[PDB]
A paper describes a structure:
We undertook crystallization trials of aprataxin that had been incubated with two complementary 10-mer DNA oligonucleotides, 5′ HOGAATCATAACOH and 5′ HOGTTATGATTCp, that were designed to form a 10-bp blunt duplex with a single 3′-terminal phosphate group. The goal was to capture a DNA complex with the 3′-PO4 strand poised at the active site, in a reverse orientation of the duplex vis à vis previous aprataxin·DNA complexes wherein the DNA 5′-OH terminus was at the active site. Crystals were obtained in space group P321. The structure of the complex was refined at 2.25 Å resolution to R/Rfree of 18.0/24.0. The asymmetric unit contained one aprataxin protomer and one copy of the HODNAOH strand. A second copy of each was situated at a crystallographic two-fold, so that the two DNA strands formed a 10-nt blunt duplex, albeit with 8/10 base mismatches, the terminal G:C pair being the only one with canonical Watson–Crick configuration. An aprataxin protomer was engaged at each end of the duplex, with the 5′-OH terminus of the ‘substrate strand’ projecting toward the active site. The duplex end is bookmarked by Phe34, which makes a π-stack on the guanine nucleobase of the 5′ G:C base pair. Lys67 and His165 coordinate the terminal phosphodiester of the substrate strand and Lys161 coordinates the second phosphodiester. The structure we did obtain, in a 5′-OH orientation, echoes those reported previously and underscores the theme that fission yeast aprataxin favors crystallization with the enzyme bound to both 5′-OH duplex ends, seemingly independent of a specific duplex length or a requirement for canonical nucleobase pairing.
We reported previously that the DNA repair enzyme aprataxin has a DNA 3′ de-capping activity, converting DNAppG to DNA3′p and GMP. Aprataxin catalyzes the conversion of A5′pp5′DNA to AMP and pDNA via a covalent enzyme-(histidinyl)–AMP intermediate. Aprataxin consists of two modules: a proximal HIT domain and a C-terminal zinc-finger. The HIT domain is organized around a central 6-strand antiparallel β-sheet that, along with flanking loops and helices, forms the NMP-binding pocket.
Author numbering:
A (entry chain B), B (entry chain B): 33 to 187, 191 to 230
Amino acid sequence: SFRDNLKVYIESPESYKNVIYYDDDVVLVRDMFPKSKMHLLLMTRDPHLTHVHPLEIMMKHRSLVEKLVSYVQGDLSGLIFDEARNCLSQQLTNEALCNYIKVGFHAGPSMNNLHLHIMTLDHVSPSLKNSAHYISFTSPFFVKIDTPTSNLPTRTSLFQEDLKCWRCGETFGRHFTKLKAHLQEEYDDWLDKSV
Amino acid sequence: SFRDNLKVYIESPESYKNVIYYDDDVVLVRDMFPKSKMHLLLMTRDPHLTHVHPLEIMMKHRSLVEKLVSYVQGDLSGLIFDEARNCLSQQLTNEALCNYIKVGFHAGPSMNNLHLHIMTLDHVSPSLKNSAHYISFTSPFFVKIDTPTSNLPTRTSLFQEDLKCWRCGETFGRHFTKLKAHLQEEYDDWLDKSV
DNA sequence: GAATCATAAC
DNA sequence: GAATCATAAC
Ligand SMILES: Nc1nc2c(ncn2[C@@H]2O[C@H](CO)[C@@H](O)[C@H]2O)c(=O)[nH]1
Ligand SMILES: Nc1nc2c(ncn2[C@@H]2O[C@H](CO)[C@@H](O)[C@H]2O)c(=O)[nH]1
Ligand SMILES: [Cl-]
Ligand SMILES: [Cl-]
Ligand SMILES: [Cl-]
Ligand SMILES: [Cl-]
Ligand SMILES: [Zn+2]
Ligand SMILES: [Zn+2]
């Protein structure tokens, strides 16, 4: 079903032009429907963990979490910063970008194969088309990779709540196209300040 | 009601920053929801014609039609080409642009105040959000300003028909997001060829 | 006209 | 997960 669509990337990464990196253990691929200017997925190729729910991963598979984090902060940081530069602006330094990138799992992923999101904060993107998209990346539904186990969520109902800017906290109620306009403004503001 | 929203531009053009030009007779204003990279409206300020249906205008008010056309081809051509350059690419010549602009009325306008559309052909725009938007500008629902009276439409049902590229005629059925992707490609192609 | 919400079918 | 269609309320 549609929930298995990511399977191809960990079985045959060598043939996908949207794949940025692969080895025996992981695959780093551009999201087909990016929810920010830059939006990547890092997927484990391990057949025994790819179907483990990301909350169970966080609770019980610390070694994988730490391996994922090591790729992002280490060997793949170059690729990731360069990709962000390709997607946002060519003259952004790594330092400028390091605090404009978030890394995390969805608490209730629609796809079966374990995928870690690596994306810029802006949420400026044509593929961001409804409130549920936004809330899923800016609420506790987005389980940041460094979340203490004692703080992991579970129960959602966040998707009926009011929209708030992730950067300044302005509320927009359920007015998603107002939020969209504001996210573009926040991004122009951040970009102008950062170059 | 919402059908009267354009009234403000012909009553108080002097205060709107989206107004490009006004005199006693007409107002040229940026559409708030542009359906192409460049999308302008030219509105008569005449109180006795602004509420005349555009098909009746074409049938019975040749002098207005011809006045509108004269503004577009003459005194406002400079503004219009410069605006297109601001919206598409700064190094496009007028000749390059003259055949990438269409001028016309909707056959069934949602707004009460007579407005002539002046827009680029691309239909590449975030405000183009559904098939009805597209069809309304690329089908006979779009009454080109130079349409012979003997060829004017009336009856619609075009809005249930299949989507076709205005530039090459490829059909997309009712797959609007496929059409969107293709319009972007057609535009990149046109732009690369034209600069 | 725009925009939010709900609903199939994949 | 995406996307088409329908439906209020402005
Ligand atoms: N690269 C890629 N990403 C996808 C595909 N299908 C869904 N996604 C994204 O994967 C995430 C699933 O939680 C969402 O961000 C989806 O937009 C796909 O076929 N390829
Ligand atoms: N400039 C402007 N255009 C509008 C407004 N409301 C609707 N339109 C556009 O006017 C046209 C009406 O047929 C459509 O292209 C609408 O998107 C408005 O308030 N201001
Ligand atoms: Cl680590
Ligand atoms: Cl929008
Ligand atoms: Cl004329
Ligand atoms: Cl799209
Ligand atoms: Zn803000
Ligand atoms: Zn085409």
